[PDB]
Structure formats: structure tokens, C-alpha cells
């Protein structure tokens, strides 16, 4: 057994009215260093994990697409379009 006598005493008897004021500026400085090392360092890894599948597996993110057919309108010099909904699928393996 470890002789934890002094630590046991510390745990049993601790002040219950002692507190220290914290310099807001230094607290903010440390926290914003933490944010700097999160957004700009771990953000790279997080964004890679989130996006790389969306780059190498794009077809699963855009399920439905549209296709068009066109006809002329000679007497008005216009073009008439008919649309169609399709399931976005692979093509020409």
C-alpha cells in the first residue's frame, strides 16, 4: 500500500471559501491559442475526413438530375424545351 497519508488529509480538509480572481486577458489568450490550434490544425484533418469521400464518391450525394429535349419554333425563332427527371447514375463505365 502507498503511504497516501498527506494526500488523504488534503482531500478530507480543504478550504471552502478560498478563491482567486482570474486575469480575463490571460484566460482569453490561452483559450484563443487553443482555438488557433483546433481550427487551423485539427480543422485540416476534420475537413479532409468530411470531404475526401465527397470528392471520390460524388454520385451518392446528387441523387436526382434533369435531362432536356429541344424542338425548334421557326415562326417565332424560339426553342422549346421538355424536361425530365432522372436518377443520377453511372454511365459509360
Amino acid at each position: 500500500m502507498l503511504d497516501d497519508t498527506k494526500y488523504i488529509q488534503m482531500a478530507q480538509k480543504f478550504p471552502r471559501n478560498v478563491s482567486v480572481q482570474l486575469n480575463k486577458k490571460l484566460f482569453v489568450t490561452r483559450t484563443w491559442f487553443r482555438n488557433y490550434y483546433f481550427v487551423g490544425v485539427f480543422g485540416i484533418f476534420a475537413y479532409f475526413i468530411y470531404n475526401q469521400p465527397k470528392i471520390f464518391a460524388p454520385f451518392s450525394g446528387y441523387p436526382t438530375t434533369v435531362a432536356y429535349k429541344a424542338q425548334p419554333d421557326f415562326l417565332n425563332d424560339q426553342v422549346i424545351f421538355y424536361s425530365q427527371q432522372r436518377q443520377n447514375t453511372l454511365k459509360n463505365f
Partner: protein, 148 residues
């Protein structure tokens, strides 16, 4: 690549034409094709704002250079890739190919329809297409015309 090869080249008039159904067609067609070099202007502006903040608060120059790079990096990351823009480009290119084919058919037969067009403009004051008017007429006949 196959669709773009069939189209060959794209002119701004057609892009603005298709803007009706996809207001971000230019913003999507830039991210699919190597048309022009894209600078992360929004990212650089945010970086300049952070630079002004640091200059006001007297931060070391390393911090402000890093805070200029970071928003630029975010802008680049959110700009490149974006394979959805390729799907939208495919849709636009299909539309453009159909439009160009129909336009070629218009030009090819323009002389043949000159006389009929001249006769038609003087009788119908509407600019609506012949197909739409004929479908409406067919519905009108199917509804009101007595079967007899």
C-alpha cells in the same frame, strides 16, 4: 469530357440564357472547367480584416500572416473539389447541346419558312410557340367540341 467535347466551346450568352433555371451557373461552371484562375477573394478579404484587427491590437507579424493564410486556406478548401458543380455543369451542357441543335435546325430551314412565317405573323398577334398553342387548341377541342 465527352459532353464538353461535343459542345466544343461555351459562350457567355448561353450561360446567361440558362441562368433562368440555375442562377449560380457561372459560379458552378467556373468550378468545373479550367476557364479562369480563381483567387479566394473572400478569404483574402477576411484575412485583411484579421490583419487590421491584429495591427490594432499589436500582435506579432507571424500571427497576422498565419491569420491571413488561414481564411485563404478555408476559402480554397471550400472552393476546389465540389463535384456537385460538375453535375450541374453536365445538366447545363445537355441543355446547351439541345438548344444548339434546335438553333441549327432553325437556321437550316429558315429560308423554307420565310413565306409561311410572313403569312403567320400577320394573322396571329401572339409570340407564343406553335406547339403550346396547338396543345391548347387540342385540349379546347377535346373539351368543348361536340363528339357528334
Amino acid at each position: 469530357l465527352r459532353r464538353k467535347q461535343q459542345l466544343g466551346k461555351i459562350y457567355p450568352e448561353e450561360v446567361s440564357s440558362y441562368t433562368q433555371i440555375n442562377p449560380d451557373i457561372a459560379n458552378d461552371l467556373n468550378l468545373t472547367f479550367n476557364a479562369k484562375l480563381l483567387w479566394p477573394v473572400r478569404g483574402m478579404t477576411v484575412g485583411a480584416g484579421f490583419f487590421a484587427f491584429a495591427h490594432l491590437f499589436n500582435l506579432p507579424y507571424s500571427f497576422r500572416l498565419g491569420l491571413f493564410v488561414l481564411p485563404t486556406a478555408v476559402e480554397l478548401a471550400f472552393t476546389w473539389g465540389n463535384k456537385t458543380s460538375q453535375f450541374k455543369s453536365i445538366e447545363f451542357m445537355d441543355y446547351l447541346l439541345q438548344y444548339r441543335v434546335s438553333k441549327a435546325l432553325l437556321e437550316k430551314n429558315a429560308k423554307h419558312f420565310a413565306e409561311k412565317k410572313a403569312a403567320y405573323q400577320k394573322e396571329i398577334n401572339s409570340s407564343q410557340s406553335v406547339q403550346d398553342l396547338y396543345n391548347q387548341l387540342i385540349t379546347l377541342v377535346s373539351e368543348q367540341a361536340p363528339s357528334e
